[PDB]
Symmetry: C2
Subunit: 537 residues, 2 copies
């Protein structure tokens, strides 16, 4: 009966479990509920605060993973499985986790809050790669992660309606952030030094808390890894959200043969369907064949997001904000295998020129013929117009540039111009344990395990250099949480990480060599995506 | 005759000529200067095809250059060598259809390869009698027979009412062709070999050479071609029938000339030559640079279709061709009409001046096309940087008008079965009078090819004297064999053919031949493949 594992939060008492990290113990409080389960009449609805409970709630195990699509492209392949749910699915999933140092910090400690990715259609706070025991132990961080609704359950909107207003997955996140303001002190976290971090759709979510006023009072700093609120995939208009919602309805027999009058009736019908029925048809609502496009995503609703994220980053005022943003070396490789003909994890996917032109209409699905051609003409190496290696690598780059790198460059530029303090990075180390082929390089998400400190687990078989690398990254991130600046006060000469600016455009390479400072982030090519391409439409 | 030099009396089809013995550095040469090849195109013959020169009686004196064809005389910079060197150096007259021959002394016993020079001047100026076209060095050092002709420029050679009998257009091209015919019939009198005739020319001379390649009746008159910094395809070398009619009609109005093409032309014929020169520049549809009012027309006669159409669909089996560019094709005309630019300072310009310069250098571009140019050539790390802008302005004009047309031509020709050799000339004359920033402007390779540095009274450096010999060797080797390489000397590095697969070309400078690949390949994809489509929107 360890009093270190016994905490009273506002809703009552919790019992944690004592977990072991390589260099000592950590206290963990797993599966704490922060909301009423969003089930039955509450499906598609904003989350409500969890009611207080009697006695001592057992918070010693991860709670259920939110209901979602499960990947079966390569069944039993570690590459894909590591992202799949590692707990039972259930709409009753609004739970968070807290790792803290053992014994619980003497003074108030900066808090990191993690927001998983998964395209807004998948993910869970309980995956091995998001294990916060290492940051808690080695760096003394209080780490929090939360589940949020994904797919139709988190993101299906009939904008304007009372019963399905959209963005509820994001509100799940916001409620977990409120939960932290009110309760993290009890675990010895500092509600006054809260840093959000997230990757891919997680990073997009972080960016939305930045652009949504009611979230701004709940954190002080942000880290966006390989994702942004602006750009092609992360939001949809009200019009288009209505369209997919009503189309998902029609596809699952809602309403019987009316069909729709109003939203009230349509939503009522949608609530009566088994979770897996919605999910069965989640993927049939996209307007085009595509990759890096996802059916149910935050919506520009004039509420959570008062205007488009583009509009909001152009005019916002980010004076008292520190932000850390970066991308990996190969943002685009991963999704190629999910629907670009010619691509597979098994061979080396040396593609033809025709496969490349058809792959571009899939990668830039909203591109008109002329825009399509601009992209091809830009990305072809004219010295070797037909070399299959070049063509395979350019395909990857089209997707990564369009979806991640250029949106990130755009965000970094705007935030810096409007007064934020920005640090930017590219991550270039391919993990030795990686099970994807070499041609995919460093795919998105394969930095997370390093930031989270997994290589410090002797049992996991990372090279000894990788362990030292991971130590560095955890220092950068937690220094950034502590101070707003990833640089290490005690340390010199081994170069400083300079702020990113519109003028100098400096970012650093994160790999096994010490920091290298580079200038301009795909600057010519992003001028193409961010300045010319819009104008061509 | 009786008392004069036996080597200097020659008979041609039209009569008897007395040439002159001239000093070259390494010995004497024979020159026959001002041989008439046409009836003077005056009075009622203005705007009409040339007629062969009627035979004459007695011995025609061919010891001095003849008239220069009537043209605009530049005065932008009085006393300034850099511009003066291109200015007429004999009387301006419409009676200008003369040509010049240089051969060894004594004339060679066996037939010698003939090189025929076609001067540039944008189709509005030029003269075979400029110092930099002095044939004596190629004649003396390489034993070449060199021939150069005057051809009508400006209105006199190019004003066209397409379809009319009295001003069909392209007559300047016809003067050139008439001199090619004269060489066929008469060059053997001089020891020239009519079965080994190589055309070389620079700028509008190069575009001229290319017109002859593309025009069947000119085809039988030569075997090999050199095009220096110019092409028959591209934005300035030709105008449509419509546009030619429009400029001709406007010029007519501007000088007081009112259905009938007949009475319009008849009226133009009564106008003094200087009147047409005075209005020559007022007929261009836009403010521009690298655009000329009267240039070859696509008449469906001389040019059976556009040059672009004829290069794509023509069979170039029998053709060996040398093509190339200088380091800075665009710098020269920047001082003529892009505000910000000058010979007398370093011409650092602003972003505003650059955007304006782009509308002037690419006068046919829509707003969108122009914004594509500006996007492409902006350096997004240093987008306001005046040195880069100044150089980018040069590159836009140079690439659009010369470097990319040359690549499109080299490519199409190589694919249609021609042997193509390619170069970029990079040596700046030690004597050049333009400021440093202009680099190697077009035209400044010419004095090297013709071997002027061999005249010890000319102030070139010793390495320039050797470099000139190298180039004269390349050119006359090319004329001799269709291969610029020295057949024995496998010691020196080989100039390989340009091919679509490897796109090889050589650098010409003081260092030995170095081999490079792709001619602005990426950038030329922009001008040659993309930009056309953006001009179908």
């Amino acid at each position: 009966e360890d009093p270190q594992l016994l905490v009273r939060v506002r809703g009552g008492q919790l019992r944690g479990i004592r977990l072991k990290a390589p260099g000592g113990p950590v206290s963990a409080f797993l599966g704490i509920p922060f909301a009423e389960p969003p089930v039955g009449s509450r499906r598609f609805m904003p989350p409500e605060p969890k009611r207080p409970w009697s006695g001592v709630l057992d918070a010693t195990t991860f709670q259920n993973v939110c209901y979602q699509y499960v990947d079966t492209l390569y069944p039993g392949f570690e590459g894909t499985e590591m992202w799949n749910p590692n707990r039972e699915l259930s709409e009753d999933c609004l739970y968070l986790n807290v790792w803290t140092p053992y014994p619980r910090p003497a003074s108030p400690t900066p808090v990191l809050i993690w927001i998983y990715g998964g395209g807004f259609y998948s993910g869970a706070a309980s995956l091995d790669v998001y294990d916060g025991r290492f940051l808690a132990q080695v760096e003394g961080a209080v780490l929090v992660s939360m589940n949020y609704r994904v797919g139709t359950f988190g993101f299906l909107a009939l904008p304007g309606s009372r019963e399905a207003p959209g963005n509820v997955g994001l509100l799940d996140q916001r409620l977990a952030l409120q939960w932290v303001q009110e309760n993290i002190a009890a675990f010895g976290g500092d509600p006054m030094s809260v840093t959000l971090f997230g990757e891919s759709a997680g990073a997009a979510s972080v960016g939305m808390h930045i652009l949504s006023l009611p979230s701004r009072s709940l954190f002080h700093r942000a880290v966006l890894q390989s994702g942004t609120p602006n750009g092609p995939w992360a939001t949809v208009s009200a019009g288009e959200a209505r369209r997919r919602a009503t189309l998902l309805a029609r596809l699952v027999g809602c309403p019987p043969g009316g069909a729709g009058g109003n939203d009230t009736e349509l939503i009522a019908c949608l609530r009566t369907r088994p979770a897996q029925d919605l999910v069965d048809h989640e993927w049939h609502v996209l307007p085009q064949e595509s990759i890096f496009r996802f059916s149910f995503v935050p919506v520009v609703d004039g509420d959570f997001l008062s205007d488009t994220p583009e509009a909001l980053i152009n005019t916002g005022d980010f004076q008292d904000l520190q932000v850390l943003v970066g991308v990996v070396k190969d943002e685009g490789s991963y999704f190629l295998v999910y629907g670009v003909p010619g691509f597979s994890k098994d061979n080396e996917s040396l593609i033809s020129r025709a496969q490349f032109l058809a792959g571009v209409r899939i990668g830039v699905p909203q591109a008109s013929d002329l825009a399509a051609e601009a992209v091809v003409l830009h990305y072809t190496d004219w010295l070797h117009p037909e070399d299959p290696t070049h063509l395979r690598d350019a395909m990857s780059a089209v997707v990564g540039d369009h979806n991640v790198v250029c949106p990130v460059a755009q965000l970094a530029g705007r935030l810096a111009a409007q007064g934020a303090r920005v640090y930017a990075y590219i991550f270039e180390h391919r993990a030795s344990t990686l099970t994807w082929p070499l041609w995919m390089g460093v795919p998105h998400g394969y930095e997370i395990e390093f930031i989270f400190g997994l290589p410090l687990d002797p049992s996991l078989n990372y090279t000894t250099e990788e362990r030292i690398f991971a130590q560095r990254l955890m220092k950068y991130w937690t220094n950034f949480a502590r101070t707003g600046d990833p640089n290490d006060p005690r340390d010199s000469k081994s170069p400083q990480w300079p702020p990113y600016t519109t003028a100098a455009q400096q970012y650093v390479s994160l790999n096994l060599k010490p920091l290298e400072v580079r200038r301009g982030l795909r600057a010519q090519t992003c001028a193409f995506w961010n300045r010319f391409l819009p104008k061509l439409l």
